[PDB]
Amino acid sequence: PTINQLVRKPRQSKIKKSDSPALNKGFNSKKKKFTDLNSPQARGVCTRVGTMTPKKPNSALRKYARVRLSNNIEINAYIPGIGHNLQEHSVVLVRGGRVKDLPGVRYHIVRGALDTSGVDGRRQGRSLYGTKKPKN
Amino acid sequence: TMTDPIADMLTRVRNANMVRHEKLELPASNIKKEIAEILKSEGFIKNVEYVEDDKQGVLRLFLKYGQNDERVITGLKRISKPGLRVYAKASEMPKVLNGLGIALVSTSEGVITDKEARKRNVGGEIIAYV
RNA sequence: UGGAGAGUUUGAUCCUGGCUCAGGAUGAACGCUGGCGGCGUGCCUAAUACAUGCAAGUCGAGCGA
RNA sequence: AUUAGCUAGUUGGUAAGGUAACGGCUUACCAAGGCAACGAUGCAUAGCCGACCUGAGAGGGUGAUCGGCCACACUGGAACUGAGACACGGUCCAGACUCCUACGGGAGGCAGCAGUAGGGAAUCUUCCGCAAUGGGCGAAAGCCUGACGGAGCAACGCCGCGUGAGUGAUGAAGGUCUUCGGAUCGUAAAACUCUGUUAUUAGGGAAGAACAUAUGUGUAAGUAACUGUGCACAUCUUGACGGUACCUAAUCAGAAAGCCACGGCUAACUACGUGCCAGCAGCCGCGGUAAUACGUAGGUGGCAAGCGUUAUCCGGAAUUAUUGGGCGUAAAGCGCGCGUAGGCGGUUUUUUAAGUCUGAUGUGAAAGCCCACGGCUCAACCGUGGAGGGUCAUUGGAAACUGGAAAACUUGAGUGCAGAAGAGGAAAGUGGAAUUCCAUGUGUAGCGGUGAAAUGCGCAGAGAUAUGGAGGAACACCAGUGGCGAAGGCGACUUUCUGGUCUGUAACUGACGCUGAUGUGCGAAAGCGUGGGGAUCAAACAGGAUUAGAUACCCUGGUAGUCCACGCCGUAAACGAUGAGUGCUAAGUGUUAGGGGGUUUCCGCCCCUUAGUGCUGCAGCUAACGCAUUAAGCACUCCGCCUGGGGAGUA
RNA sequence: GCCGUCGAAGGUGGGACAAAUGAUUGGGGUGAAGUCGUAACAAGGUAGCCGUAUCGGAAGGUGCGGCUGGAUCACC
RNA sequence: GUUAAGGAACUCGGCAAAAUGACCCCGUAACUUCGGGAGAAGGGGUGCUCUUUAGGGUUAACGCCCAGAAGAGCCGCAGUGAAUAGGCCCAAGCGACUGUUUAUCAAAAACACAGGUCUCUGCUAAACCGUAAGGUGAUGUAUAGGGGCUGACGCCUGCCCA
Ligand SMILES: [Mg+2]
Ligand SMILES: [Mg+2]
Ligand SMILES: [Mg+2]
Ligand SMILES: [Mg+2]
Ligand SMILES: [Mg+2]
Ligand SMILES: [Mg+2]
Ligand SMILES: [Mg+2]
């Protein structure tokens, strides 16, 4: 507004918040690295084999994996692709991005470098799922 | 109250052009006797008189129109009003409509136009546009 | 010298208004594939105890022996 | 600022001591100050600049290699030598840790160069070596140099470059689509023809090295080119890397190419399998019996030794808007006055140069972006020049506005005099009409209430009906668009005391202003505290029915409350849903209190000028509705507030 | 070698601020509405809404003030 | 009266004893009716001799009594060196408080209390003592007198009249 008021208080701009909460900050030090920052990726360790549904009008079935992350906290997940060589308490790489119409799930289990290593059943969409073909 | 009546003169320039009046009877002083006699030598007003008594003498304005009863003065914009002061750079004051108008500056020599400042590189307060 | 947009509230509009995408980036990670001439940059997370190597000497026209 | 006070040797003199010097620099008697709403003090986050990133720019986010400055050395103090260390590799002490000894004692500090261990989704050789440039020591040869000159390893980033082209119609084999009456990739493939950047063959072989040392004979002290130099050369000399950069000659077009997508956006389409399932998804979402929007082959598009996905940051986002927004109903104008600091201030002339203007000097070092070129075969990078910092200090000219300073000016603002209109307040009396309850009669079976009914009062004499007297509260008719106060609000009358506004202007000192962050004072009703008084209406409460059920709505009853005096609480659809102040711009028609032209015709009349008050209506503005001289129009000043909806005016 | 001023660490004691946690406990959003009623939007069938009291299983109902963002005939 | 090492293990129970104790200083929380908490807690110093200086009153003044500061020094195991003089803290229960009670087995959480209500009394008042006269209530008169219940202050006191 008035140039008198703008001297007396500047434009304190709009804060934003992260779309994906449970990563990427200095958390809660407890004389060791009790919890840390994972900007793109991490390890995991699993806790539960997941089976769930979307909720809005949709009626399909989905297979998450409710884990405890490497910084004491609890998140859901998802395995893209077909195969599932995963059981309880097995290491899984992470990468962010929510899943719409599921009520509370958080990230994608990377199908390349983990115990989630390689998914067969795919032949054209490949590097999104970690499937090889050394002929070409 | 009435703060900076120089804008109130240039308000009544816009008032009489809009409803297409002819005679404009406003009180004005030696600040504004320096003002409107710029544009008479630039092509906006038919005739500007002199103030009668230099304090309470009203300066009568008879505005200039076109042959088609078409408007000569498009609009007006104050620049340096009380609360934010604008002063001109050396050769870097801006142009009115790519040079087609008069930007009024009152430099350290008196009220001139923005054309006359580029022969002596002066600054001064950029008062109004056209 | 140089400055773009699209989608979605309604049976259908104009407006306010949020959220979302295309683009540029990384001393990035990770996903598939792999010919290099040549140029650069490679502890950013536990300030987690540091094997083995070398980094400060020189002077024999100081002066001893 | 959901942190307002803060230090006490703190602030100051004085004294002598104290370090390179000033010094509360550390101590001693007196002295009453420091800092602060212009952010003092206290918390959590942080090495900082030159530069990197994005952007039209203004700006936003970042602090890495690369240079300048700074601090620190497992942790916490304190020293010693010397030119100017509180010392990284020294040192005495104290603490938590490793490990050995004869258990009396001593040793150890890789945030030096690397390598291992460790939390990790994540960052490399334990490489010869001083030749060049730089540094200590010596008069010199030289000597130690993990500074550095370079190599060993990862698509880690940009750059350049190839996996070939010239020649080569009959739609050859053959894939999924098809009347498979047929198309597509496709001169593609199959052949034919040259080429060998690149490389599956070895070698001659850098300008990067100028010197130093003296020795070739020159500079003065040449006495003396031995010495410091090497001012003829520095010529018997100096290359790990490097049998490198380069380059020729060979059997050979033969080894040397992916990756994501293809509804709409958005660049790119077809046939089946599953068929609201395994899924997919940046949003619209495509999926209930294939489905151009899921896996598959064909096809295409993009980029290309690289393609996608993630998390993060800037642009898109005019979505924090100085350049560049908004408040009547969409988010947003305090419930409203007096008012301190503060912000802004009409006109005139004359100075001052504090801002502003331009001149001059010095400086804001390399290196980057850009503006250019020999060269690395171009290019990435190097080289030379060029622009790029001042809200700065200081050094002259100009006086136009904003500002301190001298003088008068009268439109704004204030008083004086001449006059009206008021429900503007505050104490005290006083008056009329209706409601309820008490006294008697005449009188008597009903009065009430309702869609219907009752519950109830009545026959012990109710209502009806008259005089009677007891109280308390409002203030019919005037009364209407009217009036008034800044708002909440104020309507019977009389009296004493008491504010403000307006009409006309001869007078009066002479800018004495507008806005107001905190502060402070009035606030409709309800509610509460301590006392009075209590007719009516009446939350709570009991009753009858309406209702399947009923505090509901309906009915006779009914207490706190309503009224006064005193002290508080301060909110509302506290509204014109429109903050104040000044000037401004087409016009018609009312109404109230005043003034201008008449014999003033009396609520006859028209003629005007000023201030409140309502209606209708151009230009303009607005999303539209609608404002529209009492603006939501054009501008100026200052204040308050908003930035998706809930969560929430909650904790 | 002893005495004294200054002096890290340690030990003693009452406080000050955040954080981790705790038997139960009070609202809040989320769903899927099965359970109990219709309180709004038509005059929503007792016209609604803002303050402020008091009562009820449940929206909510009544009292006293203000508002039209109150149909009919806009309540002449 | 004293006691090695330990310090409630004793016991119905820290019952009795032991420690704390004066003056002068620094410093002091929750909580609240803003007075209080508070001697809160936890801490330090004190003896004798010698040198200088600033403090009242008395008085012409030497003289006399009242005092407080720093500095220097001495001695003991110990300097209010003997006697006299509080232990403290956290959390609940009942009663608001100071008071008063079973002379002689019970001192309280019982009784009083300031305040809240409810009812009775128009003056030769009701009430009580006295067979009556006379008196108390009172030389007081509804802001005053007799009785019943509750027991400062705060927020409150719900339905039923067979
Ligand atoms: Mg070193
Ligand atoms: Mg190095
Ligand atoms: Mg009231
Ligand atoms: Mg009102
Ligand atoms: Mg005590
Ligand atoms: Mg206590
Ligand atoms: Mg008697």
Please give the helix or strand (H or E) that residue A8 lies within, else none.
helix A3-8
- Chain C nucleotides covered by protein, CB below 7 Å: 20, 28-34, 45-46
Strand order in the sheet with B104-107: B77-78, B125-129, B104-107, B110-113
Residues of chain A neighbouring B84 (CB-CB closer than 8 A): 3
Burial of B3 (0-12, 13-18, 19+ CB in 10 A): exposed
CB atoms within 10 A of CB B40: 14
Q: Give the whole-angstrom CA distance, residue A45 versus residue A24.
A: 18
DSSP B116: G
Query: How far, in Å, is the CA of B122 from the C1' of nucleotide D357?
Result: 6
Query: Residue B79's closest CA among B37, B110, B124?
Result: B124
Query: Residue A74's closest CA among A33, A107, A100?
Result: A107
Establish how many alpha carbons lie within 13 A of residue B98's alpha carbon, considering only the half-sphere containing its beta carbon.
0
Task: Using alpha carbons, list the distances in angstroms from residue A116 to A17, A108, A110, B30.
Answer: 31, 11, 7, 87
Residues paired with residue B107 on neighbouring β-strands, in sequence order: B110
The answer to whether A130 and A119 are in contact (CB under 8 A) is yes
- Kind of pairing, strands B45-48 and B77-78? unpaired
Please state how this structure was obtained: cryo-EM
Q: Give the whole-angstrom CA distance, residue B66 versus residue A106.
A: 71
CB atoms within 10 A of CB B7: 16
Q: Give the whole-angstrom CA distance, residue B65 versus residue B87.
A: 32
- Kindly state the greatest CA–CA separation across chain A: 72
Task: Using alpha carbons, list the distances in angstroms from residue B33 to A123, B1, B20, B51.
Answer: 86, 23, 23, 7
Please give the helix or strand (H or E) that residue B60 lies within, else none.
strand B58-63
Residues paired with residue B58 on neighbouring β-strands, in sequence order: B27
Resolution in A: 3.6
Q: Give the whole-angstrom CA distance, residue B64 versus residue B47.
A: 8
Chain A stretch 2-61, residues whose beta carbon is closer than 8 A to a beta carbon of chain B: 2-4
